[PDB]
UniProtKB/Swiss-Prot annotation, chains A, D:
The chain holds residues 24 to 123 of 160 of the full protein. Keywords: Cell membrane, Ion channel, Ion transport, Ligand-gated ion channel, Membrane, Transmembrane, Transmembrane helix, Transport. The chain crosses the membrane at residues 5-27, 65-88. Acts as a pH-gated potassium ion channel; changing the cytosolic pH from 7 to 4 opens the channel, although it is not clear if this is the physiological stimulus for channel opening. Monovalent cation preference is K(+) > Rb(+) > NH4(+) >> Na(+) > Li(+). It comes from Streptomyces lividans. Homotetramer. One of its GO terms (molecular function) is identical protein binding. This is pH-gated potassium channel KcsA. Signal peptide: none annotated. Residues 39-49, 50-57 dip into the membrane without crossing it. The cytoplasmic C-terminus is involved in the gating mechanism. Disruption phenotype: Cells grow slower and to lower myceliar densities. Residues 28-38, 58-64 are extracellular. It is found in: Cell membrane.
Length: 100, 97, 97, 100
C-alpha cells in the first residue's frame, strides 16, 4: 500500500497550490512589479511553478512571495518524484513476482 | 515486462502532445494575447511544456488552454518519471544477481 | 541509513546555493547586461535555477557565471533525484516485508 | 556495475551537447529571429535545455533547430533520470545488505 502514499501527495500538492495560490497573492498584491496581483493569476503560477515549467510570465518579487514559491516548487518536485517512486517500486513488484 | 510500460508512456505522451497540440490551438486561437495561434506553434509548445523546459516564448492565456497545459505537463513529467522507474527497476534486476 | 544521504544533499545544495549565490554575484556584477548584480537577486536565482523553474527573469551572461550555473543546476537536479531515490528504496523496504 | 552506465550517460550527454550545440547553430544561424547565432551561445543553450531550466533567453525558431532541441532535452532528462536510478538501485544494495 505505497500508492496510498501517491494519492496523499496528489492531495497535499493541490492544497499547497490553493494554499500557495491564495497565500502568495496577498504576499505580492499591492507591491512594485507585482504580476501576481489577482488570485486567478497566482493560481496558474502555482501550477507553472510546481511543474517547474517556469514559462516566466509570472513570478514573485517580494521576499515573502519567493518563499511561498520555494514551498510550492519543492512540493511539486517532491510529489512527482514520489509518484516516480511508486511506479518503480511497483515494477520491482512484478520483477520479484516472477523470480520469487 | 515493465518496459512494455515504457513504450506505453512514449505513445501516450506523443498522443497527448498531438492531442494537446491540436486541442489547445482551438482553445486559444482567436482570443486576446493569443500566442498559440497556429497548430505548428502549439505543437512546439507541447514539447516545450511536457519537458517543462518552459522557455516561455509560448503559453496559454485562456482558462481552457491552461487545462490542456496541466494535462500535457503531468503527462510528460509522469512519462519520464516512469522511464526513470524502468531504468532503476532494471538495475535492481542485475543487483539481485 | 540511506536517509542519512538525503539530509546530506539538503545541506550540500543549500551550501551550493549560498556558494553559487555569493560566488556568481561577483562573477557577473559590473559586466554588461548583468542581471545578477545584487547578492539578494543572485540568491533567488540559485533557487530558481536549482529547481530548474527557470522563470528567466535572472540568468548569467558571463562565461563564468554560466559555470556557477551548471554547478547549481546539476546540484539541485542531483539532490532531488537523490531524495526521489530514498523515497523509492524505502517503498521496496515495505515491499520486501 | 550499473554505475558503468552512469558514466556512459555523462559522456553521451556531453556529446549530445557539443553535438546539438554545433549542430543547432548551423540549423538556425542566418534565419529570421535567430538568437542561436554563434556557437558559444548555442553551447549555453544546450546546457539550459538539457537541464530544462529553460530561462528562455535562447531557443530554436527553425523547424530543424527544434529537433536538435527535443533530442538535447530527452537526452538530459534521460541521463539524469538514469543517475537517479543508480542512486536508488544502490540504496537497495545496502537495504538487502541489512534485510538479509
Ligand atoms: C521536475 C523536473 N526535474 C527537476 C530536476 C527535471 C526532469 C525532475 C528530476
Ligand atoms: Rb524544468
Ligand atoms: Rb522561462
Ligand atoms: Rb523551466
Amino acid at each position: 500500500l505505497h500508492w496510498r502514499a501517491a494519492g496523499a501527495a496528489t492531495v497535499l500538492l493541490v492544497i499547497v497550490l490553493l494554499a500557495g495560490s491564495y497565500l502568495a497573492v496577498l504576499a505580492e498584491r499591492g507591491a512594485p512589479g507585482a504580476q501576481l496581483i489577482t488570485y486567478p493569476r497566482a493560481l496558474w503560477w502555482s501550477v507553472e511553478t510546481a511543474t517547474t515549467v517556469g514559462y516566466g510570465d509570472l513570478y514573485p518579487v517580494t521576499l515573502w512571495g519567493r518563499c511561498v514559491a520555494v514551498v510550492v516548487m519543492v512540493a511539486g518536485i517532491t510529489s512527482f518524484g514520489l509518484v516516480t517512486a511508486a511506479l518503480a517500486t511497483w515494477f520491482v513488484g512484478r520483477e520479484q513476482e516472477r523470480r520469487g
